[PDB]
Every structure is written in structure tokens, then in C-alpha cells.
């Protein structure tokens with residue numbers, strides 16, 4: 001019930017939301033069908049439109065008008081945005097030359113520069129260049145302020161997940177808005193774009209910026225706007241709020257536009273019809289900026305112009321139908337479109353089997369335009385699994401396509417309407433969106449590299465003097481956007497210090513069931529090998545310091561001629577293995593006599609070692625090496641590579657991938673990048689939370705042993721950004737690429753895996769590209785501890801994702 005008989009007189013776009021049954025006058029009252037009876041009359045005035053004209057200048061105030069051109073309007077805070085231009089000979093903001101904003105130039109009683117977030121739905125990154133001729137206000141923001149060529153959204157690349165990520169700094173799995181449509185099985189409730197369940201606060205986790213502000217004594221404008229409030233009225237409302245007295249005035253505001261998304265769905269991302277929506281958004285930006293100029297706030301406010309996601313060409317004819325793959329299509333529920341999520345139609349059907357559905361959807365048609373995954377097998381970079389609202393079966397849909405359950409869903413919802421859609425993998429170029437920051441706290445005429453939208457919450461907090469709630473940004477990684485208000489983090493403290501074992505065991509103390517043809521024997525070279533075991537080559541192979549272990553554990557540093565490792569006594573294998581391969585390195589084979597060679601490590605007890613007999617008895621599991629024998633510096637150094645302490649468990653199907661990486665790709669990268677430093681290791685994430693598993697979370701072991709089986713293997717591949725300098729003698733910034741490969745017992749993910757590894761392995765590895773920071777979370781390790789570079793620069797490097805998309 002609402003008693004809509006109250007009135008909005010003096011309450012128009014009130015900030016505090018009043019409680020039912022009392023009627024509302026706030027910017028969401030329309031959406032709840034709760035506005036007072038006189039809301040339209042008083043709060044949504046339209047009389048005489050949005051612009052002063054010469055005949056209205058100095059008019060007698062008429063309170064019916066949408067905005068005012070009377071002498072008193074500036075003091076009332078309710079002039080039309082073009083008032084000073086039309087009536088007082090002033091210029092539009094866009095026509096003024098850019099002049100650096102070195103310090104905030106704010107009116108008296110402003111405690112901090114305000115922040116205005118101007119969010120645009122469906123604003124694809126390439127619109128900034130492609131539309132620049134019809135967007136002069138936006139172009140001025142971009143050229144004069146701080147901009148990125150693009151900003152990466154989160155997956156899925158849909159509106160609600162992305163706007164809520166912008167507001168919280170959290171991945172959708174953590175904030176709980178995992179799609180525009182969701183089913184929560186604990187609630188037994190559905191969230192939809194249409195309807196009222198989405199108003200329930202139990203959907204919305206984390207702590208959005210408006211709550212962070214309010215809790216810390218910073219007042220916030222409401223970020224949401226009912227669709228029927230016209231944009232001109234949204235801007236005039238923000239500008240009116242900015243004229244409030246100091247104790248009442250918010251410091252943070254958001255504007256939201258449904259364009260260009262709305263038109264993009266109908267016309268495609270570059271339809272001729274798209275020019276007009278871009279012009280109109282630009283006009284709205286111009287209104288805001290002219291408005292700020294009138295209030296003398298144009299060199300005081302920080303303005304963020306930001307999108308939620310891009311837009312791709314998608315039509316009804318590019319739809320895959322699950323009815324063409326499954327016999328049982330009526331026994332499933334599909335969330336359809338540019339991603340798929342499958343669950344059982346009935347939890348009473350015990351014959352529902354996710355394994356049989358996955359298999360029926362795997363590599364069945366030669367040009368198949370989606371790929372099925374159990375959610376835990378999705379690329380870790382998507383961070384899309386640790387939420388009960390995410391169904392176990394996921395379909396990654398190729399760009400330009402849809403998936404649906406049956407054809408009747410597509411033409412009974414028989415011709416096609418739409419030409420654009422979004423939601424695809426967040427690395428896809430068409431899904432990228434925009435970031436511009438303009439104002440005293442941002443840099444002047446500065447281009448920054450692309451970054452992820454999860455990072456902005458921290459920065460918005462920095463812009464407002466707020467302490468951020470715990471989030472998925474890496475605070476400091478965007479300091480290069482800012483003139484001032486930078487956040488100066490300290491490196492985390494190392495929790496576990498390593499042991500440095502010497503030679504402590506005789507060969508005959510080991511009974512591991514291993515063999516090696518190595519009984520082959522000089523004081524020149526004897527001292528020399530001793531020195532390698534004490535760390536004499538460590539400066540070449542450990543270039544950025546040893547990684548720090550940020551949890552409590554027992555581990556040993558092991559040195560060798562060609563590689564250094566941090567060996568876990570608890571997991572019986574390295575946490576990390578570090579080695580440098582120069583441009584000139586030679587690849588060699590594993591010699592015949594060493595094919596099955598595994599050698600005890602006399603620095604590490606038998607009790608803390610793996611054993612070969614476990615691998616012999618486990619018919620499913622084989623082993624690989626972290627430092628590859630193929631890249632040994634000499635025949636004698638190669639023996640080190642067969643130490644039991646360099647062995648890790650690997651499924652034969654995975655060994656195909658791993659061997660190709662090690663034998664072919666590492667050397668290829670060293671040739672292309674002028675040397676590389678490689679750090680490789682295992683990851684255990686059995687509960688798919690993106691975080692390092694403790695020992696008691698491990699679900700699988702090599703049969704009959706305590707050797708845990710990794711869920712993934714990582715590598716971090718670092719070189720000099722200036723590739724004229726070799727990796728191991730680099731004076732300046734670094735360049736990195738990394739991956740987190742799923743450790744799977746089949747290559748079902750790769751439909752062409754019967755072919756030579758040169759036709760499918762690198763494609764697999766690109767799909768599983770990762771940030772250094774992703775590996776940090778998954779391992780509890782902290783990398784790049786000892787470089788010449790600033791810590792903020794290193795944080796930016798740790799958040800870099802190598803995407804393998806063209807321009």
C-alpha cells in the first residue's frame with residue numbers, strides 16, 4: 001500500500017527515502033509506483049522546455065517553467081543550463097580552450113571537490129574515436145583530462161553486474177549480481193529486469209560507494225534514476241543539489257543514461273541510426289558542464305565519464321539451439337542469449353546428469369559457436385564461479401552469437417527485431433567500454449593504459465577521502481591517473497621465512513621407487529657445482545627477488561645452475577620455480593638414457609619427497625617438471641632438472657600442453673622478447689573461490705600417496721618493456737604475460753586437440769591468460785618484491801592482462 005494523498009511540495013528529489021505507506025518524491029518513486037499524487041506537476045515540470053532564449057532573459061519568474069531565465073535563477077540554483085550563454089554573453093564550456101586545473105577552484109564552503117559519475121550504458125570503447133566528430137563535449141573531456149583507450153568490464157558483460165561492480169569494486173560472484181536475470185536456490189527467488197523482487201536488498205551484496213560515503217560522513221546523491229525522468233531533468237536535479245547549503249549538499253553524484261545501449265540493441269553498434277543517440281549524450285554532457293560553469297564549479301568538480309560495457313553485432317539468425325544437441329531439452333532451464341547457464345528444470349528429476357549434458361554439448365558441430373563448461377573450469381580470469389546463483393553448467397558463447405533452448409523462444413518473443421547485443425567474454429574487443437576522468441584531482445592531457453573496472457571503486461574512494469570497503473581492486477594500481485590523493489600502499493609482510501637446506505641425506509636413505517642412469521663422474525668443476533647449489537647463479541634466475549609467502553607454512557629454497565625454487569614440505573612440490581632463458585638459449589632433448597630418470601634430492605628428506613611408485617600405481621596420473629629439462633644450460637646441468645623436487649603431478653592429456661609450452665613456446669617468447677624470466681608453479685583451488693586452498697581442502701591425491709593434485713598450473717613470463725634490452729639486464733619498466741592453465745585429464749576444451757600441438761595449445765593458453773594478481777590470490781605469494789621500480793608501477797604491472805585481441 002501507498003497513501004499517495006501526501007504531497008511533494010518542497011520535497012522534489014528529496015535525498016532521504018521515506019517509508020511506506022507514506023508517499024515518495026525521490027528519484028526512484030516512479031519505479032516503485034509510489035510517487036505522491038502531485039509529483040509530476042511539481043517535480044517533472046516541462047513548461048517551455050530546457051533552454052533559455054533571448055525573449056526569456058530577465059523574465060518574471062514563473063514557477064511552472066521547467067527551468068528559469070529570470071535574474072534570480074543563479075541564487076535559486078535553477079537556471080536553464082544555457083542561461084549565462086543566452087542572457088549574459090558567456091561561452092559554452094565546450095568552446096573554451098582547455099586550461100590545466102592545477103588546484104581545485106571551489107566556492108567558499110566546499111570541503112572537498114565533489115565527484116560526479118556520468119555513466120553511459122552500452123558505450124563501446126571505439127565510439128570515442130569513431131564518434132568524436134559528433135561528440136565535442138566528450139572529446140574535450142577526453143583530450144583535456146585523463147583517459148584510457150578502453151576500460152575492461154567484468155563478465156558477464158551485462159548492465160546490472162557491471163554498474164554494481166563499478167559501485168563496489170567487487171567481482172559479480174562476490175557482490176551477488178551475477179546476471180541481469182538470476183535464480184537464488186537458498187531464497188528460492190528469481191531476480192529479473194521487470195518486476196519487484198530486484199528491490200529486495202538481499203540480492204545486493206558488498207558495500208556500494210553511496211553507502212561507503214554515508215557511513216563515513218560524506219553525503220551522497222541517489223545513483224539510480226527512474227527511466228521516465230528525462231535526462232535534462234536528471235542534470236537539473238544534480239545542479240540543484242549542488243546549490244544546497246554546505247551541511248545538506250552531497251559530495252558524490254551519479255547520472256545514468258540508458259543510451260547508447262537502447263538504440264545499439266535495435267541498430268547494431270555502428271548502425272547509421274547510432275549517430276543521433278551519440279549526439280544527444282554529448283548534448284547532455286554539455287548541459288552538465290555549462291551548468292557547472294554557471295555555478296563556478298567547472299574547475300572544482302571531478303567528473304568521471306564511464307561505460308558499463310560495449311555492444312556487438314548480433315542477429316536472430318546467429319542463434320545456436322540446444323534442441324539440436326540434447327534429446328532431453330524439456331528437462332533443463334536455460335538462461336539464454338550471449339551466455340548460457342543451465343540447471344535442472346526440476347530438482348525432483350533424479351535422472352538429470354550434468355556430465356551427460358556437457359558431453360552432448362561438446363564439440364558436436366564443426367563450427368559450433370558456444371563451448372560448454374562446468375563453472376569451475378571457466379578461465380580463472382573471469383572470476384565467475386563462487387556464487388550459488390551461478391549455475392554449474394555454463395556456456396561461453398562466441399562473439400556475434402546467441403544460444404537459446406528451442407527455435408520457438410527466438411521468434412515467439414517470425415522475423416528479427418534486434419541487431420546488437422552484449423554479455424560475451426570480457427576480453428572481447430567489442431565489449432570494451434570507456435573511461436575519462438576530468439577535474440583537479442585527475443591528470444592533465446594524460447593517456448593511461450587500459451585497466452579493469454573493478455579498480456575504480458578504490459579511486460573514487462580516494463577522490464572523496466574515503467576508506468574503501470574490502471574489494472577486488474588493487475589499491476595503488478591506478479595512482480598514475482591522479483595528480484594528488486594517491487594511495488601509498490606498503491608491500492605485504494612475508495609471513496613464512498624459507499629454510500636453506502644443505503646436503504643432509506644419503507642416496508640409500510631414499511626408497512622412492514625411482515631410478516636414474518646417472519652413475520657418471522674434477523676439483524675445478526666440483527667447487528663450481530657446489531657454488532651453484534649455494535646460489536651463485538641466483539641473480540640471473542631470480543630477477544625480481546624471491547616471492548614472499550604470505551601464509552604460515554614450511555618451505556625450502558633450493559638453488560641450481562639453471563633454476564631456483566621454493567619447495568613446500570607440506571604439498572611435496574614447489575610453490576614456485578624461477579628461471580631465465582636468454583634470446584640465445586638453445587633447446588635440447590631429454591637424452592634416451594634419462595627418459596624415466598627421477599633423482600632423490602639429498603637436501604630434502606625422503607619423508608618430504610614425492611615417490612615414483614605412486615605414479616606407477618596411479619594409472620590416470622603421470623608427472624612433469626617445473627623447470628624444463630629441454631632448456632638446461634649443459635648436459636651436466638640437465639641432471640638437476642630430474643630431481644624429485646622439480647617433479648609435479650600431471651595427467652597425460654595435460655602433459656601434451658605442458659611439454660609444448662616448455663619445449664617450443666618458452667624459447668619462442670625468449671626470441672621475440674629478448675630473453676624471458678619464467679616463474680611457474682601449481683595452484684590448488686578445489687572450492688573455486690579464486691583463493692589458495694589450505695591442505696585440508698584438497699580433494700584429489702596421486703593414488704595411495706599424500707601428493708596433492710593441482711587444479712591448475714601457472715606461469716608468469718617477464719621481460720624488459722624496452723625489448724632492445726635483454727630480460728636479465730633491464731633498466732626500466734617491465735613487460736609481463738601470464739597464464740593459469742586448467743589441469744584437466746582430457747583436452748575436451750580444445751576441439752582440435754587430435755591435431756599437432758602447434759594448431760591448438762597456444763589458443764588454449766590465450767583463453768587462460770591471467771593477471772599476476774590472479775596468481776597471487778590463488779597461491780598466497782607476492783611477486784616482484786625487489787625491482788628498481790616504484791611500488792605503484794609494480795601494482796599496475798600485477799593487474800595487467802595480456803588479452804591477445806588485435807586493435
Ligand SMILES: *[C@@H]1O[C@H](CO)[C@@H](O[C@@H]2O[C@H](CO)[C@@H](O[C@@H]3O[C@H](CO[C@H]4O[C@H](CO)[C@@H](O)[C@H](O[C@H]5O[C@H](CO)[C@@H](O)[C@H](O)[C@@H]5O[C@H]5O[C@H](CO)[C@@H](O)[C@H](O)[C@@H]5O)[C@@H]4O)[C@@H](O)[C@H](O[C@H]4O[C@H](CO)[C@@H](O)[C@H](O)[C@@H]4O[C@H]4O[C@H](CO)[C@@H](O)[C@H](O)[C@@H]4O)[C@@H]3O)[C@H](O)[C@H]2NC(C)=O)[C@H](O)[C@H]1NC(C)=O
Nearest residue numbers: 173174175176204205206386387388470471472689690777
Ligand atoms: C574479492 O573481494 C572480496 C571482499 O574482500 C573477497 O570476498 C571476501 O572473502 C572472504 C573469504 O572468502 C570472506 O570472509 C568470510 O566472511 C564471513 C562473514 O561474511 C558475511 O559478512 C561480510 C562482511 O560484512 C559480508 O561481506 C558477507 O557478504 C557475502 O555473503 C552475503 C550473503 O550472506 C552476500 O550478500 C554477499 O554478496 C557476499 O557473498 C559472497 O561471499 C560469500 C562468503 O562470505 C560467498 O559464500 C558468496 O558466494 C559470495 O561470493 C557475509 O554476509 C565469515 O563468516 C567467514 O569465516 C569462515 O571462514 C574462516 C576462515 O578464516 C573460518 O576461520 C571461520 O571459522 C568461518 O568458518 C565457519 O563457517 C564455515 C561456512 O559456513 C564453516 O565451514 C566452518 O566450519 C565455520 O563454522 C569468512 O571469513 C568475505 O565475506 C568475502 N566478502 C565478500 C563481500 O564477498 C573475495 O575473496 C575477493 N576475491 C578474490 C578472487 O580475491
Ligand SMILES: O=C(Cc1ccc(Cl)c(Cl)c1)N1CCc2cccc(Cc3ccc(F)cc3)c2C1
Nearest residue numbers: 031117119160163164166167223224225254256
Ligand atoms: O538508475 C538506473 C536505472 C534503474 C531504474 C530503476 C530501477 Cl528500480 C533500477 Cl534498480 C535501476 N541504473 C541502471 C542499473 C543499475 C544497476 C546497479 C547500479 C546502478 C547505479 C549506478 C549508477 C552509476 C554508476 F556509475 C554505477 C552504479 C544502476 C543504475
Ligand SMILES: [Ca+2]
Nearest residue numbers: 121122159308
Ligand atoms: Ca548496460
Ligand SMILES: [Ca+2]
Nearest residue numbers: 685691692693
Ligand atoms: Ca580455494
Ligand SMILES: [Cl-]
Nearest residue numbers: 030033034035
Ligand atoms: Cl507513481
Ligand code: NA
Nearest residue numbers: 615618621622
Ligand atoms: Na601413472
Ligand code: NA
Nearest residue numbers: 747748750753
Ligand atoms: Na579435444
Ligand SMILES: [Zn+2]
Nearest residue numbers: 122261265422
Ligand atoms: Zn543492453
